[PDB]
Design brief:
Two copies of one chain form a homodimer.
Chain A: H1 11-14, E1 17-22, E2 25-32, E3 35-39, H2 54-59, E4 66-70, E5 73-75, E6 77-83, E7 86-91, E8 100-103, E9 111-118, E10 121-129, E11 148-153, E12 156-166, E13 172-175, H3 201-213, H4 227-236, H5 244-249, H6 251-257, H7 261-274, H8 293-300
Parallel strand pairs in A: 8-12
Antiparallel strand pairs in A: 1-2, 1-4, 2-3, 3-7, 4-5, 6-7, 9-10, 9-11, 11-12, 12-13
Helix pairs in contact in A: 3-6, 3-7, 3-8, 4-7
The complex binds ligand 7YY (2 copies) and sodium ion (2 copies).
One ligand 7YY binds near residues 25, 166 and 187 of chain B.
Chain lengths: ~300, ~300
């Protein structure tokens, strides 16, 4: 029993983190096989960060302008290339701790673990969701550029996020590992705005199922609703609309608890219209939306 | 910016987890140097779990009744001894991934990371606090017995918790790594009750400082209070009393924010008497008490 914000074990990723310095600019990189992946922003000097011309800046560098440090060992850069917003540094040593891995772009609403790193050293691990406005509500200080987000499927690390910047509202933005931004952001040191965020409805329903599994049942009720009446209320409250795909995804949890999805939707409609009135669910006084159906199954069934 | 439930990176511990089986009873163990540490409950059969006589049960076993599996490799048990509630299995191979480590007993109110494991394999990592009633509000399924809790100080893993059981209320109890229980529990499969829990006041104040650092300031006010008037209100609300030691521990955070501890106490007194009225702090609608002053500093300053 119990329900916590649970991250994936980070050891397989920790062995891939390095420090990358170009001049006095320094950040984290990811060392897989004989390539180091890092934000191309590392090739900027102070003057360059506000409005860089990356193709120009890269032409002016040589392999020896790049200092890669893997703990004590320095790694020899033998080639470099740019792919969208990442830089790929070819090094002369393949990382012997390279896990089985793949590069995967995630969708809004999906969760992943973040390994926060500073000067190439892992500092902490936490779980977070990609928000509908393509930002994450992370926890990052100066120096965390290049930290990665990942999921684990069996023995395979799926890398899905490389951290680039903090926006003025204190939320975070980054790219997939092919260097393509999540959201309408660009890698320059200018103020950019995220679009308005929304609540991830299918995740809130998954978390209500988790509560029932853990014995929190006070919000349940005898009523049912239809997708359409639900979505008309949800829209009013800045909730993502629910689809029949969402309903099938919640299948295993409906099975395990015997409560139909549209039955649980009727409970959610009640909570939205009446609030919770000082009761809590799984120790929270707000509706949680950062746990996926799969997160709940992984944690409440194994 | 941002503030998350952040665990320590788990790689150094992941390499120490093994599976221990005695008969058909199986659970997790911790392999450091040439010793495997695990809950002595593993020597119980089904019939033995309700009221075991461990000294008898251990006399009847031989080194070959113990199957230790480190992934694929089986490890040869060459001696065994019992220390309080743990079993120490001497094996013929020293773990080459043994980190620098120490065994440390923590106090109520302190936090640690848990690596949840099943059949010797790491499944997830999360952060939690030792509650004042010596339980933890973990997240664990059948098969997690033997999972460990730890902190990291530089390069040194401090092990502080070995998981044994879930109590009827769904909270968890275990021992330090010398086998001594936290709290008034015993390792038998009987219903035991935890004492009443209380809110960890110094942690709530640390979390309010974190909020101010992240720009949440609405609860602040011009008033101050004294330790004594504060403690008379706190007691009423089932909060741990605050000591002058707690006040000095909050020192760095008072410095960084310019708000004196007894000034922040006056804000806490207000929140306790008036509630929060649908406002949130750091994304929560409840007062959080699972972050220590040191957790806040580590995460908000580096
Ligand atoms: C508070 N916060 C939360 N997340 C972040 C991440 N982040 C960061 O760590 N560093 C950045 N700029 C740099 C400055 C440097 C100074 N030196 C010596 N070396 C430096 C290297 C970096 Cl990367 N930034 C800003 C930033 C980074 C980008 F990659 C980008 F495309 C635009 C940006 F504005 C930053 O957000 N800080
Ligand atoms: C739901 N939950 C949350 N945490 C726990 C931890 N836990 C556990 O994993 N296992 C236990 N009993 C066993 C049964 C076995 C059946 N086989 C084949 N092998 C088994 C091994 C174990 Cl350890 N228990 C119960 C338990 C374990 C103890 F170590 C103890 F001292 C008293 C107890 F009641 C358990 O709580 N389950
Ligand atoms: Na209902
Ligand atoms: Na005040």
């Amino acid at each position: 029993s119990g329900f916590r914000k649970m991250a994936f074990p980070s050891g397989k990723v920790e062995g891939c983190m390095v420090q990358v310095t170009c001049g006095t600019t320094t950040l984290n990189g990811l060392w897989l096989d004989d390539v180091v992946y890092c934000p191309r922003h590392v090739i900027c000097t102070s003057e360059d960060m506000l409005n860089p011309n990356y193709e120009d800046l890269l032409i002016r560098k040589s392999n020896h302008n790049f200092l890669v440090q893997a703990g004590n060992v320095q790694l020899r850069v033998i080639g470099h290339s740019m792919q969208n917003c990442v830089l790929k540094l070819k090094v002369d040593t393949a990382n012997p701790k390279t896990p089985k891995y793949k590069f995967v772009r995630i969708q809004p609403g999906q969760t992943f673990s973040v390994l926060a790193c500073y000067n190439g050293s892992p500092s902490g691990v936490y779980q977070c969701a990609m928000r509908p406005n393509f930002t994450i509500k992370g926890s990052f200080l100066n120096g965390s550029c290049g930290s990665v987000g990942f999921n684990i499927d069996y023995d395979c690390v799926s890398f899905c996020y490389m951290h680039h910047m903090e926006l003025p509202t204190g939320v975070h933005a980054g790219t997939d590992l092919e260097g393509n931004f999540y959201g309408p952001f660009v890698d320059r040191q200018t103020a950019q705005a995220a679009g308005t965020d929304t609540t991830i409805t299918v995740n809130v329903l998954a978390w209500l199922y988790a509560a029932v599994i853990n014995g929190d049942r006070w919000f349940l009720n005898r009523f049912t609703t239809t997708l359409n009446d639900f979505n008309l209320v949800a829209m009013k409250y800045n909730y993502e609309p629910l689809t029949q795909d969402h309903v099938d995804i919640l299948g295993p949890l409906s099975a395990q608890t015997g409560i139909a999805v549209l039955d649980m939707c009727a409970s959610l409609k009640e909570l939205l219209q009446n609030g919770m009135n000082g009761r809590t669910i799984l120790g929270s006084a707000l509706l949680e939306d950062e746990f996926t159906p799969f997160d709940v199954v992984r944690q409440c069934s194994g």
